[PDB]
């Protein structure tokens, strides 16, 4: 497992394309970490990261839409629990 915190601000966008969906047994796995962005500029948000919780939101029982909704309206610090699949 893993734990990454992406602070908002800076640039603005989060740069992060998650790929998966609770309708296919997939803990929302990142497939594209845009560069020059919070996720790719926090030395942790790297592709192959199955998120299971965003800001204390256990996404394990959430669909790909419930996971992107949190990343869309995150708080000052985007604490994202990740399951690296390297």
């Amino acid at each position: 497992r893993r734990r990454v915190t992406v602070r908002k601000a800076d640039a603005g966008g989060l740069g992060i394309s998650i790929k998966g969906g609770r309708e296919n047994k997939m803990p929302i796995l990142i497939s594209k970490i845009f560069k020059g962005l919070a996720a790719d500029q926090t030395e942790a948000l790297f592709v192959g990261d199955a998120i299971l919780s965003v800001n204390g939101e256990d996404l394990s029982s959430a669909t790909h839409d419930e996971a992107v909704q949190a990343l869309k309206k995150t708080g000052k610090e985007v604490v994202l629990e990740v399951k690296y699949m390297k």
Partner: peptide, 5 residues
């Protein structure tokens, strides 16, 4: 599903 936040 491939979104982009």
């Amino acid at each position: 599903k491939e979104s982009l936040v």
